[PDB]
Each structure stands twice: as C-alpha cells, then as structure tokens.
Amino acid sequence: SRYTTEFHELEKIGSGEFGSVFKCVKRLDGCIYAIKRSKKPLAGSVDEQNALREVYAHAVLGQHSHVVRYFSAWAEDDHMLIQNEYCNGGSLADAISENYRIMSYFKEAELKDLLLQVGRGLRYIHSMSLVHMDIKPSNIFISRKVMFKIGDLGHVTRISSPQVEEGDSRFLANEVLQENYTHLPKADIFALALTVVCAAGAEPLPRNGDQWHEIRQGRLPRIPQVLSQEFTELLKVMIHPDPERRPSAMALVKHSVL
Numbered sequence: 001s002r003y004t005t006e007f008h009e010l011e012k013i014g015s016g017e018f019g020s021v022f023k024c025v026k027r028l029d030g031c032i033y034a035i036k037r038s039k040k041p042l043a044g045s046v047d048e049q050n051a052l053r054e055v056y057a058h059a060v061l062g063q064h065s066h067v068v069r070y071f072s073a074w075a076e077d078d079h080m081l082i083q084n085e086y087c088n089g090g091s092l093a094d095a096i097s098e099n100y101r102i103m104s105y106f107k108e109a110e111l112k113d114l115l116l117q118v119g120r121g122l123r124y125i126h127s128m129s130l131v132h133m134d135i136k137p138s139n140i141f142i143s144r145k146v147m148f149k150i151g152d153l154g155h156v157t158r159i160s161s162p163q164v165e166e167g168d169s170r171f172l173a174n175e176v177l178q179e180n181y182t183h184l185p186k187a188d189i190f191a192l193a194l195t196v197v198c199a200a201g202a203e204p205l206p207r208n209g210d211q212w213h214e215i216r217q218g219r220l221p222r223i224p225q226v227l228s229q230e231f232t233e234l235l236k237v238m239i240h241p242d243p244e245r246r247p248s249a250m251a252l253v254k255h256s257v258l
C-alpha cells in the first residue's frame with residue numbers, strides 16, 4: 001500500500017459526503033499533509049467529473065499562497081486517495097463554530113483581512129479564466145500570522161464553455177440558479193460576501209423561502225456586532241441582484257479598505 005508505505009497516519013481530521021481526511025506525515029520529507037480518502041468514483045459519473053475538474057484546476061493554477069495545494073492522487077482497492085496541503089487552523093467553518101463555543105468573534109479588521117485574502121485567491125483563479133463555484137466557509141482553510149486558502153476545487157470550471165455544478169444553495173446567486181452562466185465570476189463574489197457574513201456571526205443562512213429571496217434582492221443578513229456602515233455597504237453591493245453591479249475580484253482586491 002502506497003498510503004502506508006510512504007505516509008504515517010496521525011489523526012482523522014474530517015469526514016462526510018466528501019469521504020474522510022487524515023492528517024499524515026510523509027516519511028521521506030517529514031512534512032504534514034491532509035490526505036482525503038473517498039470511494040473510487042464511478043467511471044462516467046458526476047463524482048468523476050468533480051475529481052477531474054479538481055485535477056484540471058490545480059494543473060492550470062499550480063501553486064498559489066491562497067489555494068490549498070494539491071500534490072498527488074492515486075487509487076487503492078475501491079478508494080481514491082488525494083494528498084493535499086495541511087492547514088493547521090482547520091476550515092473557516094471550524095473557526096466560526098469555535099467562536100460560538102468560546103464567545104469570541106472576528107472583528108471588522110479581521111473580516112476585512114479575510115475578504116482581501118480570499119479575494120486575492122479569487123483574483124488569481126479568475127485571471128486564469130476559471131471560476132470556483134462553491135465558495136463557502138467549509139471550503140476556506142486557515143494556516144496559522146494567518147493565511148486564508150481556497151480549497152476543494154471540485155466545482156471549478158472554465159469561464160468559456162462552463163460546466164456548472166451548482167454549489168450550496170445557501171451561498172448561490174440567483175442568476176446561477178436561473179441557469180444564467182454568463183457572469184460566473186460574480187457568483188464567486190456573491191458567495192464570498194455571504195461567507196464573510198457568516199464569519200461575522202450572522203445566523204445560519206437560509207436554504208430557501210422568504211429569507212433566501214430577500215438576500216437575493218440585496219438584503220444583507222443581520223450581523224450582531226457593529227461594523228462601519230461603509231463596510232456593510234461593501235458587503236451589500238457584493239450581493240447586488242445585478243451581477244454586473246458587484247465588484248470583480250480584481251476590483252475587490254484593489255478596493256480601498258486598509
């Protein structure tokens with residue numbers, strides 16, 4: 001087994017529909033990697049395209065400081081193993097859930113830092129003619145003196161001739177749900193705004209119903225802590241019902257707020 005031959009397993013760090021992920025030491029270099037163990041996707045299936053989407057994306061992108069690195073992938077028995085960069089801070093979803101536990105929270109200054117860092121990852125992805133299409137806190141990772149990294153590229157597709165697999169409906173822009181795949185970079189912007197809203201302590205986001213449509217009409221979820229009215233205004237226009245009104249990642253990362 002390549003897995004046990006060249007890695008030593010330290011700790012299971014996650015499980016779910018995605019399979020399970022283990023923190024491991026690679027014996028040769030002594031470095032830490034997050035290895036994902038999934039059922040071998042059925043050939044010709046959705047899961048296979050997800051996995052080849054992920055391969056293509058990292059091959060296009062290569063290494064970037066705000067993207068979780070992708071090292072190798074192989075099969076053993078009826079499972080697929082993926083070797084990724086290990087981010088010692090977990091996902092933003094873990095950090096949020098931790099904030100509820102200890103009654104802490106991300107201040108405006110930290111929320112701005114989160115927006116800028118992920119914005120730069122998006123800036124790079126979009127500059128390479130790709131879109132991520134599943135931005136959300138559980139796909140943002142933390143290396144700790146803090147680096148935010150975009151992970152799980154299974155939904156990445158090309159701006160020209162896209163193959164869209166819709167992301168989590170809680171973070172999905174209305175126009176994508178309407179099968180309008182013509183301004184997809186602004187779908188990432190929309191989902192990043194709501195990702196930051198979650199980080200700010202907002203209540204869990206709706207999957208459907210009155211509240212869902214109210215957000216897609218441009219109404220920002222209520223945030224308990226106090227933010228400058230202009231930072232609030234920035235998040236608002238990132239969820240503007242008109243995608244062309246939302247700032248591009250390029251515009252977002254050259255935006256004035258530091």
Ligand SMILES: CC(=O)NCC(=O)N1[C@@H]2CC[C@H]1c1ccc(Nc3ncc(C(F)(F)F)c(NC4CCC4)n3)cc12
Nearest residue numbers: 013014021034068084085086087088089090091094151
């Ligand atoms: C004793 C100990 O070390 N515990 C720490 C722990 O359990 N962790 C730390 C902090 C919360 C949780 C946790 C989850 C994930 C990571 N890191 C990580 N890095 C890369 C990936 C990557 F696979 F995307 F690359 C990844 N995937 C998550 C696991 C569920 C999906 N997680 C780190 C941690």
Ligand SMILES: [Cl-]
Nearest residue numbers: 076077078079
């Ligand atoms: Cl098996």
Ligand SMILES: [Cl-]
Nearest residue numbers: 037077078079
């Ligand atoms: Cl098994």
